[PDB]
Every structure is written in C-alpha cells, then in structure tokens.
C-alpha cells in the first residue's frame, strides 16, 4: 500500500483518538481481557474500524493462536489427518466462543474490517467434533467471506483443500429440501416443524469412498463424535472424514427424537445455511445450481413462506440464521426474480407486505416484540432487494408507499434504530417520480413537516439525556442513536431536495423549520453537528432549486443573518471547503446576495483558516483541493474585482506564509555508540534498528502537512492565471520564496512532492515571466552560497566531517546544504535548459555573466571536489559490511545525471538492499549520502550544455556572447579541471578516477538521439589544446599498460562490481580510448571553422578541428614509437590486453592514418577578447580614453589591425599623456601568439609521415603479427589500414604471408581449432588479393602440400569445418573461371590477359583429394555443410566429373541427414545451392549440352532484332549458360553466332552478334528412362518416413500468435512440413526440367523392384493417383496442417500438371508436336484411369461418395487445370507454345477418350439430398463448359523458376 507519509499518519492519528481506550483492553490482563470478552457486544453507536485494535487483534490471535495446537487442531492443509476430531473443553470452547462471538460482534459492529490482525488460526480449531466450534468458526467465516466478496474479494488460503472441499460440500452438506418416505420432504418450510414423517433409518450413514462404510443405527447412539469418527476411520480412509461427520451429526441428531434432535438439526442446518451464503458468495447458478437445483430446487418458494414476524412463532435461531444467509443469496438477481415472484410482487396483500403491515402496528404498539437486529435486517435486505426495477415497479403495483406510510407516523417511539433502517430502505427505493406523486398525494408530504416539528421540539424535550459517544471526538453534546436517526432523516430530505423541487418548495416554504431553522444555525451541541454540513447542502440545492425564493425567504430574516456569522463559522469541512462556490460563488451575483456578499467583504473571511493544517488535511491534499482550486474560480469569473482580495486577503497571509515557519526536530543525531555522524572503520559496530533513513516530519508537519493541500488548490486555481494576474505585480515571488528556505528545510525535501503543483504553478510565470527574478533569484542564491561558504571551503585533505564527528558542523548547515541543492537541480530540470531557447532569458544571463561572469563555478568546484572525497575517504572507514548493505548512492531512485558508474560492493544487478538493520550513521546519512552525487553531475551535464547553444539555439540573440561566451568558457574549463590538474594517480584513485569518468563523459554534446555519438564540443576541446592534457594522459597510459604487472579471472568478459583493481587500473582509462578515437573525428564531430578566417593577422591559417586533429596524431605517434620500443606487447605476449579492449585499439588504431586531407598549418592560440573583429583595439582606444565610436572609427577604417601610434584624429596627442601610460611595448602581442606542436615543429604530416616511414623502416607493421595469434581471430575487419600501409608498400606482407605458408606446416596442428583460425587469418591475407594474382608458385608452393594435407578422413579437421573456406581461397583461385589461361593467339587490340596467375590447378591434382573428398563425407557443422555442397557443385565441372560425383552415396549423407532433420534454421542457403545442384546432378548432357545447343540458336539469336547483341551485351549476359557448363558451353559456342562486321584487312572492330552460327537416334526410347536407378524404390520411402512423421503437428511455437500469424499465412512452420515443402519443391522442379526424373517415380513401391521398361510397379503410381497427394485427414485439426492442405490443393494441381510436360526446354515451343515416344505417349494416359475409378469409386457407397469428396473437390479443380494446361503456379516457367498442341493433345485427346460425358454420371450417381451437392458441380459446370470449349476450335512465397533461372 502507498502509505505516503500523510496516510499512515491518519493511522496513527487514530491511535491517538482510540488508542487511550484500548489501553483498556491494551493495559489489561487476559483474564480481564477474558471477562471483558462478552461484556462488550456492540458499539452504543457506530461501527469503528480495527485498525488501533490490531494490536488487540493479534492479542486475541495468541490468545486463541496456539489453542489450536492444544487439541493438534493446528491443521496443514498438506497432511491428510484432519487433525483428529476430538473434543474441545468447554470453558476453552467459551474461551474461544467467547472471543468468536465478541469476534462476531466486532464484525457485525466494526466497520473497514479489512485489517485481518486476529488470524492465523484459520483452518484450524473449526476441526473438532463439538458444532459449537466448529459452527462458530464456519458462521463467522460465512461473514468473514461475506465481508471479503465486499472487499471484491485478508490471508490468501485459497489453496487449502480440507476447508475449501468441507465448505464446497457443505453447500449440499445433505440436502436443500430433503426427500422422505412420507410425502413430506423436509421442506424448507420445515424450520422447526417436527410435525411430518420423521425417517428412524438415518441413525446409520453409508458412505462409499468404492471404499463403502456404515453408523448402523442405534450403534451410533453411544459411539458419539470422537467415537464414531473413531470407527469411521477405522472404516474409512483417514483422508476423507467429511461426509462421514456430516451424516454422523445427522444421526446423532437423530440418535434421539428429542430436543436434541431438534437442536441438532438447527445446528447442522445454520452450519448449511453459512456454506450456502459462502458458497454463492464464491458460486454462482453456473455452480450453485449446478450443485443443489438438480437436487432440490424446493428453494425460492420455500424461503418466500419459511419465516415472518407476522409469523411470530419460529424459533429465531433458524429464522435469522438463514436471513442473513437467505438475505445474502437474495442478493443476486437470479434469485431475486425468484421470491419476488414467489411473494406476487403486485399483492400489497400477501406476506410481501402482510408482514410489513404487521409491522407497521408492531412499531405503532413499540410492544417490545421488536427485534431491532432482525428488524434492521430485513429493512437493509430489501432496500438490497430494490435491486430489481421492473420489479420495483411490480412492487409500486403492490401498494408499496401507502403500505410504508403507516410507519412513517410512528413517532416519539424508542427504537430510533430501527426507525433509522426504516429511513435508509425509504431513501433506498426511492427511484420514480410516480412514485414522487404517489407519496406526495399518499399525504406522505405532510408526515414530512409532521416529524419536521416534532423532533425538532423534541431536541429540546431531551436536553437531560444528550449522550453522544463516549470514546470518541463529539463536535456535538446531544445523544448518539437520536441524531444519527436524524442523520438519515436528513439525507432522505436532502435526496428529495432535488426532485420535484420548485411545487414542493413552494409546498413547505415555511415547513416547521423555516422560520426556526435558526434553531439550527446555533444549536450546534443542542441540534447537532454536520447535520449543519447537511443544512448547507440544503442551501446549496435550494441555491439551485429555487434561487428565486432566496430574495424571498432573505424576508425570512435568516439568510442576512447567515452572512453575518459566516465568518465565524468557516471552518474544517472538506464539504464546505469543497462545496463552498455551490453555496457562496454564485450567490455572489444574485441582487440580494450580491449586496449581501459585498457587505462585510466576505473575501477575506473565506479563507481564515489559511495558515491552518488541518484544514489542508481536511480538503484531501488533492481531488476536493485541486477540484476546488479549479472550482473557486467561478467567483473569479463573477467578480474579478475581489481577486485582489483573493491576492491580498491572502498575501497578508501568504506573505507572511514564510514567516509561519517554526523551529522543528533535529535531522542529524549522533550515534549512541560513540556520539559520531560517520563510521570511523571497516570494523565497526552497526546502531542497528529495523527503522527508515529518512524521519518524515515536515510533510508530516503541519507547514509541510498544510502545504500539500496549499499547492494542490494552488495548482487549481493558478492553472490559466487568476489571483496570480495580479499577485506578482502585488506580490514579489522572489521577496516571497523564503518559503523555498523555510526555517530548517530538511535532507527530504527529496520529498519535494507538490513540485508539480509547486513549479507547473511558478512555469506560468515561466509562460509569463521569467525576469520577474530569475537572475536575482539566482543572484540571492549565490549570495546563499557564499553564506553557506563556511566549511563549504573545508580541508581539503579528506574527511573532517568523519573527524569531527559528534559535533554540530553541518547539523547547524544541513538541512539548508540539501535544500539548496536539490531546489536548484529542481529549477534547472523545470526552466534552466536549451528547452528555454527565450532570448529575454538568454540576456538576464548575460547580465549575470556582466556582474559576476563565471566565480560561482569555483564554489562549485569546491563544493565537488569535496563532495565524495569524504564517502571516498571514509569508504576505508565505512564498514563494507554496511556499505554492502547501504551503498548510500547505489539506491533506488538513482537513475539519472550519467551515473559515472561507481565503485559497488554486491553485483550491480542487485542494488537496494535495505530494510534489514539501520544505524544512527546509516541513518541521517544514507538519507544524504546517496544525495551528494544526484545533487552534482547534474550540475556538469547542465555546464555542458552552456556550450553550444547558438550554434543550435539561434533565435534572437545579440552579439554579448561574442566575448563574454568564450570569456565564460575560460572561466569553466580550466576552472573546475584545478580539481583534478593536481590529483596524480592514486589515493586520489577512488573519486579522481570517477570524476574523471564523468569528465570524460562531459566534453560531448549530450547528442544521442538516433543513438548517436555525444558530438564532443570542439571548444573545450582546444582549451584544453591549450592546457594539452592530452599530453599529460599520454605520459599516464605509460603507467597504466605496464600498471598491468600488478594485476585476473577472465580478460575480455567479466562485468559487475565486486573488486578488480585490473578494472580500478583502466576503469576511467576506458573512456580516454574513446574520447582519443573519435579525438580525431572531426567527421563524426561539428565542423568548426579556421582561426585563419577569423584572424588574419596570424601566421597558423586552419581550421580548428581539422589542424588539432594531426598534432595531438603527431605526438600519439611518438608515444606509439615509444611503447614499442620496449616492444610493450607489439610483438611480445602474454595477451594482457582484454580481447575487447585489444578490439578496441582497432579504431584507437584506425584514426592512425585519419588525417584530413589539406596540410595542417600549425595550431595558434585562444583569447575572449581577442575575437574577431579584434575588440582589443578599441578596448584599448578607450582605456587611453578614446570613446568607443570614435575608437572603432579606427578598426572599422582599418580592421584586423593595430595603430600603436599616437596623435591620429580619433586618437589625438592629448591621448598622448593617456597612451604613453597604456603603451607596453608589446602592442603587437596584443593579438593571439601561435601555439606550437608540443614536443615537434609541424601539427601536420610534416612528422607524422616519416615516423610512419619509421615504423615501415622499422618494420613494425609486421612486428605486430607477431602478436596477431593472441586476439586476431576478427581483426580481418581491421585488415583495411593494413591495406592503405600496403598501397604506400614501405614494406612487404605478402613475403610475410609465404612465409607464414612455409610456417603454415609448422601450425603443426596450431592448437586444433586455432589452426583454422589463424591460418583462416592467413588465408584473408590472401583475401587482400591483389598480389595474390602472381605467387602462383608460392600459392603452388603450398597447394603441394594441400595435396599432401590430405587429410582423406577430414572428420578427423573439426577446425576445417570453415578451413573448408580458406581453402575455398583457394578454391575461388583454383579454376578462377579455368578457361585453360589460353591466350587467344587471334587478331585481338585489346589484352584480355592473365590478370591473375592460377596455373589452372593441373587436373591430376584435382582427382587426387577428390577420391578423399569424396572418402571423407561425414567431418562436422552444418555450415560445413553447406560449404562442402556448395563448392563441389561450383565443381562438378566436367559433368563426367559430375557423374562420378553422382551414386556418390555422399548423396545418401546428405539424404537421410538432412531429411532425417526434426529442426534446423537457416538451410534456406543450401537449399538454393542444392537446386543448383540439381540443375547440376542431373546434368544430363543431351539435356544440357544439346540442350544449349539446341537453345543457341535461340540463346545467342534469341530472336534478335532482326541482330546485334553486342558481346559484352550479351556474352557478359551468357553468364548463366557460361557457368551451366563453361565445357558444354564453349562446346556449344563452338557453334554460335559467326558475328559480322569485321574490319576488311585482317582488323577486327565490332562485338555487335549478327551473322550466322559459330561457322555456319542419340537419344533412345530409354534415353531418359535406363538413366532411372531405381533410388526411388526406397529413396521415397525413407522420404515419406521423413515426411509421414506427422507433417501436420503445430510446431512449438508461440509468435505472440502460434497458429494464426504463421499457420493461415506460414504453415511451414511444422518443422516436419517444413522439409516437405521443400521435397515437393525439389522435385517437382527436377521433374519438369528432365524428362528422366519425371519417368523416375513410376515404379516406386514400399519394397525394391527393377523390370524390363521398369515394368510400371503400380503401387508409385496409383498411390501417387490415391493418399500420396490426398493424405486425407479427419479435419482442420491445426491451421498450420489445415492451411498446408489448402496450399496443397492450390499446389498438387501445378505439380502434376508440370509433371505432365515434355522438357520445359527447347522443344518448349511446342508448335506441332503431336506425339512422345513409345514409352512416353500412352505415359500421358497411363495411371488416370484408376481415378476414372476413384471418381467411380465415389459414386458407389455415398458414404464414400462423400468420402472422396475433396478429391471430387480437386478434381474439377484438377480437372481444369489439367485440360486448360492451367495451374495457380504454371506458365511461369511454361510458354504460350509448350500449350499449342499440349491443350489440343489433351482436349482431342479424352475426345478420342470419350471419357468425360461418362462421369456426368457420376452426378447421375449421387443423390441431391447433400449439402454440397448442390455446390459441388457448379465448379463441375465449367468442367462440363471445358468438355468442348477448348475443343470447339477443333477440326508471396511461391517460387516459379525457368532453366535459364537455373
């Protein structure tokens, strides 16, 4: 819960209000509080909460805790003993009904019973025999439930099992109305109507559970509770007890047929009754009819006839016990209905209102036949029971006001209780304006003036009396019960107000109150109090009901009156104080309350209670108080004069506001150990407390208290101006914001709360106006500071405040240090930003920047030097084992101002871990200490951004900047760089190192956004040129590399925060390597402009960036060189540098050679005077005396230049005497002097080039391989640089790279798995190719040994499972598209030379580890994998090649391997590389060679212009007929395109293609079948088994949507279809492009089968006819399997249509074919006719008729498609011509069939009693339309492909 500090002190307020009482009960003994149990009963007037009786509560708890373990009744609803039931002793059963009762009670009198202090003995002691408990328990916990479903539904018990089942059973413990052998049932009806047959067999029980048992009867008349569940167990399973009790009690009950029975009976049955109230409270009909109205529904009826007052003989035990029980259930609508009904809901007659009747009288006699708590009952059930409206309407049909009326005359009576239920149900149903002129003509308006006058007499009648509550505050002195009584009659004629207000006003404008409702007005402790607050809600709605009547009744001489006390009686009322404008406001414009208003200026008297808290409190702190500071301004909108009363009427009060404040508790204490604000030691005691860092008071306090709500109405109100138009010209917020200082602002104004409504309110001011103070609001700040400056300027050798302890140093300061502090980062996060972008702002600085300019920042610098030098110092003094604890900064809420990650105790991960053990130390300071660092770098962030500004601000500015900005500047860098310009390495380590983090961090434009680098400001950046620092860390990293030495677990990937001194060694470092890299990246950095643009009277002419960039580079270099020179790592070992940090060096390393391009001329100089235009020239021109005017007259005449001279015009010799003075002999010094390459002459290449030539004669860049091995595996990336040193050559590296190849062997295994990756290293030396044209023998002089490597069982090379690519190195080299190096020794004018030397790896070499590549198979990776297929189908060149590559059983690796997957990722690569590979393994050299061939005609002519193609146009465009077969394909270019226009001479000049050829069976009936090798015959059964393995299961898979994001749109994604896909693909696709595979699947068969013409073994074929395509399913079992179907119907009609094509190549043309050969013509026909029959087959046995459905579905589908030559993915790779004699070889051809007209029968064989029969043959239709259509003439993901695409 947020208890916020105001809640939980509203928690404790109550204390104070009850806590004296229970003192009582508190202060007393268990005995006393035993005999006090019953002796309480009920509140004599309202219920209260429990809260201050928690305490009490958990009294009661132990009181009754362990009582449970007295009798084992402690129960564990995990242990199936039900903690015997034995019994409970009397006088601890009283001692426990006692308090069950008083519990009860307290219930029943409590209100808010949320507390739950009184548990923990839940389940527990109800587990005994006797009901007494065990009902008490279950009634109370009926109301327990009752009031926790009005909690919406504290313990979380839900779990049990032996409580929740007894009570869940118990809702049927037996039976609701019961069944006998008499006609009688047991009716509900039957309370206690012993007077029907009474059944003697239930002396026994039966109880199964299959386990069967039995009481039989009179033995269970001496076996009594403990006893029969003795025997029960002893019969039964100890686990299960319940039922067994249940029909025991029934027995035992009927043991006798006595009282005993009876009472009994009335025991189990209330035991019932509260089941059946928790169980609809939990249940619902869904359940509770589901129960019991199977069983016995005897139930609506019944309970409308069991009881009634009228029926004035029901034992009231059972009769109330069901009512609140009855009532409960009533409550719902299902059953509302149902007695309402039950009752004739339009009776006025019948116990619905007999009894109401009969009561009426009761309460006229007031015979003391009136149970109140019955009575009060049944009144708040029904008004429950208005539920209903349409049967509030029945009811209004059923006499309903009349009926109630009779009681509204029964006065002067006692039971002002129940005659207060009486006018809450009255107020309850009170819904309809029929019901309006039903009371009103009932006379029931004149009973109202009736009781008007009659009480209001008898407040008087009983002054004697006036009892109001004893134990709690009574505004009021009259008896309790009476007024609130009144309370209701007063909320009743307030509710009525409204309606039907101006006749019935008019009715009673002088009811008999009127005149004497100044009874009222005074009668406070004689009328009561808040019933006031009712008599404003009065005036309020008669301030809306009749306003006309208030001139009216202002005659009555009360409203004048009114006015004249209301300022006195203003006061706490949150109603008031938030109905106020209802009532006053408008008012304020009515004539007669105008005047009355104005008199008295009723302004001032309004607020009164302004400096008051508990008013503040009163008003919500928020809601009422902001709704109400939005509210109160209608009055503004009447009377806008009276604002400045609303600001003065208050700023006499505001004003003083600061002054309100009083001295208050102490913040710091000193430990009560050793009287010490700080720990002195790691080993140090903890003051240990379980409390909170923070003490909240001053929310807590009244000022603080009262503030929240001030603001909040402040927030209200100001929102759109108001009093605030005029307060701050009344008012000076500045003068004012003492109220920002208070008296003692404490270290919570971190609870600094009402900021919102505090700085929103002050922003409009901020949209107003910020220079009503800002800079002097700033300027009294300072001025703060400086007082604040006392020990502020403290030692700055380390913690004096840790040596000082025990005294009041800051205690007298703190309070104000942290209210400063944090005050300030609040103003600067609302207003101070470049967000402001205002120029009027922008000049009020300027105006500071005039006055005191920049001296602030070194307070500040102060200020943070010794911020954390302290927490630094005393960390050694800190108890790490409080600090691991504390971490004062590490704490939640530390999120923001750059944390310069600091040095943690646990990891990281964890953070906060408090609440455990407090300390004095820990206290008062953890509440500041993680503050000190939240208060800084929040500063620094802001500095940083008061650097660019213009450069992206620019709106209306002024030149003040010119100067002054860059003046500021100076003023910041080196200012608070002092701090750490001393600090040296260490001791400092811990905070230096971090303030230089943060410094490092600072220094970058705070630009990220598109996760951009922080632009890294270049200004600062030369100030610190100046400083040259930079430098300064050059000499430190020398320290800090060999800082190595001493220094663990890991290099590269450790993180956290627990100790690293190596992390304390380059901690801060880090950032420098950055801030270096990008030092030199102006590209990635603003661009600045020269210095000699600005200044041309200077020698170093450069832009500033681009000329800062070398010399800082220059003198990197010479720190490079020296490094090296004790060869640091360069070529050295033990690979200190972490792998990330060694990374890291790569861009630390790549800016090596960033230079930009024009020569850099020197770098000058900085000055804030010296700008440009120079300024000093005047500056000084009036500092002889010359006026500014007439001093610039020279500048402007001249400009960028300086006189020095004497005796001009504008400096006339009487400025001699004034110049002589001025004149230093240095006024050509007064422009910027250049600056110099610090430890060189050139900040250029001037140097930098010849140490580059240094390292190249030195030889470095090859030093550094040396130490590659170490951290080179991904420096490839950074091999870039490398290549410019190369372009610049200066030394060789491909000698380094064939020496490696000589040191290649000595790898010697090189670490197997290193071996690869050095060596794949190697090779990418290769990858810089260049060279690696030549070195053909050296690239040989290793490819001898790759012969020799051999390795003929790879899978021994893990390593070469990418070794496989640095090979392919080799491998790209290896051919390097062979074409034999010929040299074309033809007329050629161009080279087309051997750019590369390959010496075309002679082929017995290639044979050779071919053998092994193919003896080698199975080595590792399945990227391996895709290498190992990708390169052998590059190769697989020869095509014989090829087909030896081909039956390489690899093939069957690659089989059962992939298709045997069950879940991969990415094979999508191989599988395009495999359908190359198809192209390729199936490279039938007819059907690719004389394919071409065929095709060149066609390929090169490719139907020409008609013809020039220019070769490059299309030769460079042959690429993928070029690589199809470069052999085949020379072979067939053997014969292309003779081409023409050859220059007449022996010259050639053309390329354009034109002019004849290159100078211009085979096949057999089994071409394509022999070439079958019957691989199907098992290969498609292990196919299936990859793909049968049930390609339909939903994946597991979740997407945020499993089966509908990828199921309807993916359904791939079942891994196992996932593969089919791709099988059906493949071969399909194999199908289409080579006759062969489409003749390879005819004989398939489960077992293998080889015959002569493979003799068609039917089971491929007809199964392909049958499931294999169809693979019927139940239903839509999964979208995944379910959408696969529907692409597959989309899919198996192209698949077999594609299959049905001839080549799908040349001969696509198709012109006249008519015919195939002997085994392919009647191929065409071939297998259909069992469809014939499978068609024939549905229309046999309609059951199978619908059977095939889908089938039929697809066959008209199948069918068009078929005729049509059509398919959802056909013609994409077909063309026009293949369907020239293919659509009429199809249509004339099943019209040589016949065929079709025949299945016409086939709807000839169905009935048109289907569904979609009907539907079916529409798509038919067309079929039908197909049958001659075609002939009449006679007489997304899908992937389409060509072969060319191949």
Known sequence: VLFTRCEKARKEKLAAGYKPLVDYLIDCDTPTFLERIEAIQEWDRSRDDLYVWIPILDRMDGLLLKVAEKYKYKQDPKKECEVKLVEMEAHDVDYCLKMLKFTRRLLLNTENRFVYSSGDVLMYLLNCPNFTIKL?????????????????????????????????????????????????????????????????????????????????????????????????????????????????????????????????????????????????????????????????????????????????????????????????????????????????????????????????????????????????????????????????????????????????????????????????????????????????????????????????????????????????????????????????????????????????????????????????????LVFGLTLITYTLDVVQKVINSEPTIYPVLVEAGLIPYVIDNFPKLIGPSAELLSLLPDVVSAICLNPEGLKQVKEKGLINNLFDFLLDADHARILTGGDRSTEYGTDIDELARHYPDLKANIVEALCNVIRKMPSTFRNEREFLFTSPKDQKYFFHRKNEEILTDKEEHEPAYWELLDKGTMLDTFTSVLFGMSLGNGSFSQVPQHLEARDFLAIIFMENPPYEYFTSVAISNVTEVLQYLDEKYEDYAFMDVMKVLNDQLENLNDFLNSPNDRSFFLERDGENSVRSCHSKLCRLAAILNIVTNVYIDLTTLSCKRIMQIYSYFDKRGFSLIKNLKLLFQKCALEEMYIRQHMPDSVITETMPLPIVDVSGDGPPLQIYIDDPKKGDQKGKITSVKTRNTLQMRTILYTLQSNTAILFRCFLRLSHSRNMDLEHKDLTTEVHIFENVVENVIEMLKATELEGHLPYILVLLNFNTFVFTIPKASPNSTEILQTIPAYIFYQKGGYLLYLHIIRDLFTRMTKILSSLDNINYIDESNGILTLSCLINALTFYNKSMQTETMENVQSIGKYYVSIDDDYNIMKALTVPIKVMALAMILDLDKSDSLFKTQSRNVPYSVFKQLLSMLKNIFTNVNIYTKELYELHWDLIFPPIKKISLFEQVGIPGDVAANYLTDTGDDLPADNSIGLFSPEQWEKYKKLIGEDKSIYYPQPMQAQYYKGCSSKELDELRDTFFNDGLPSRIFTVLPFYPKLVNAFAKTLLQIFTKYDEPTEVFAGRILDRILETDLDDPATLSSLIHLFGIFLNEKYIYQKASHLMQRFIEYLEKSLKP??????????????????????????????????????????????????????????????????????????????????????????????????????????????????????????????????????????????????????????????????????????????????????????????????????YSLKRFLGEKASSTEKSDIYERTGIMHLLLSQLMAASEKDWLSEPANSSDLPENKKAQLDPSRNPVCAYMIFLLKLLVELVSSYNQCKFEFLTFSRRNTYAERPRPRTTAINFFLYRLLDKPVGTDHDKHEAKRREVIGMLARSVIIGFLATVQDDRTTKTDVKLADPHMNFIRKFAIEAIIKAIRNATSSSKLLESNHLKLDMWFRIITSMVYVQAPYLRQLLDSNKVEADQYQLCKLVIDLGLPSVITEAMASIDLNYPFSKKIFNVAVEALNTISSTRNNFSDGIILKSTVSR
């Open 136 to 524: 008490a328990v279950m009634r109370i916990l009926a109301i327990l439930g009752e009031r926790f479903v009005i909690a919406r539904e504290a313990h979380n018990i839900f779990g049990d099992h032996n409580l929740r089942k007894k009570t869940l059973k118990l809702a049927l413990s037996l039976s609701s109305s019961v069944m006998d052998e008499d006609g009688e049932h047991f009716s509900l009806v039957d309370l206690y109507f012993d007077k029907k047959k009474v059944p003697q067999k239930w002396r026994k029980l039966r109880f199964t559970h299959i386990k069967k048992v039995t009481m039989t009867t009179q033995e269970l008349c001496e076996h009594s509770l403990q006893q029969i569940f003795d025997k029960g167990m002893a019969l039964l399973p100890a686990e299960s007890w319940f039922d067994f009790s249940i029909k025991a009690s029934v027995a035992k009950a009927f043991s006798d047929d006595s009282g005993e029975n009876i009472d009994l009976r009335n025991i189990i049955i209330e035991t019932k009754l509260n089941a059946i109230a928790f169980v609809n409270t939990i249940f619902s009909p869904p359940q509770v009819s589901s129960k019991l109205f199977e069983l016995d529904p005897y139930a609506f009826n019944s309970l409308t006839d069991l009881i009634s007052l009228s029926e004035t003989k029901i034992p009231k035990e059972l009769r109330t016990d069901a009512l609140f029980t009855l009532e409960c259930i009533s409550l719902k609508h299902v059953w509302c209905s149902d007695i309402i009904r039950n009752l004739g809901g339009n009776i006025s007659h019948g116990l619905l209102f007999q009894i109401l009747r009969y009561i009426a009288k009761t309460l006229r006699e007031a015979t003391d036949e009136i149970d109140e708590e019955y009575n009060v009952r049944f009144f708040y059930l029904i008004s429950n029971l208005a539920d209903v409206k349409p049967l509030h309407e029945s009811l209004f049909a059923a006499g309903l006001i009349p009926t109630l009326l009779e009681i509204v005359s029964i006065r002067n009576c006692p039971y002002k209780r129940t005659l207060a239920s009486a006018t809450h149900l009255l107020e309850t149903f009170i819904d309809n304006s029929e019901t309006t002129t039903e009371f009103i003509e009932n006379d029931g308006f004149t009973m109202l003036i009736t009781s008007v006058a009659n009480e209001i007499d008898f407040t008087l009648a009983h002054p004697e009396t006036w009892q109001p509550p004893k134990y709690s505050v009574v505004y009021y002195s009259i008896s309790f019960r009476e007024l609130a009584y009144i309370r209701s009659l007063l909320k009743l004629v307030l509710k009525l107000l409204s309606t039907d207000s101006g006749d019935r006003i008019r009715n009673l404008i002088d009811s008999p109150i009127l005149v004497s409702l100044k009874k009222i007005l005074e009668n406070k």
């Open 1353 to 1550: 069982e790879h899978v021994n090379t893990p390593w070469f499972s990418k070794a496989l690519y640095v090979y392919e190195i080799i491998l790209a080299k290896s051919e390097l598209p062979h074409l034999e190096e010929l040299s074309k020794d033809v007329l050629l004018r161009y080279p087309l030379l051997s750019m590369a030397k390959v010496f075309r790896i002679p082929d017995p070499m290639k044979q050779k580890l071919f053998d092994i590549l193919i003896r080698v198979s199975d080595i590792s990776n399945f990227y391996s994998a895709l290498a190992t297929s990708r390169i052998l189908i590059f190769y697989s060149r020869d095509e014989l090649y090829a087909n030896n590559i081909a039956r390489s059983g690899i093939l069957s690796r690659l089989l059962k391997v992939i298709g045997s997957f069950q879940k991969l990722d990415k094979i999508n690569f191989l599988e395009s590389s495999f359908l190359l590979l198809t192209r390729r393994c199936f490279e039938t050299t007819e059907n690719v060679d004389a394919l071409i061939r065929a095709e060149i005609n066609r390929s090169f002519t490719a139907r020409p212009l008609g013809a020039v193609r220019e070769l490059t146009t299309i030769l460079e465009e042959k690429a993928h007929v070029v690589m199809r077969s470069p052999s085949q394909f020379i072979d067939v270019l053997c014969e292309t395109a003779r081409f023409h226009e050859f220059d007449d001479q022996g010259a050639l000049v053309d």
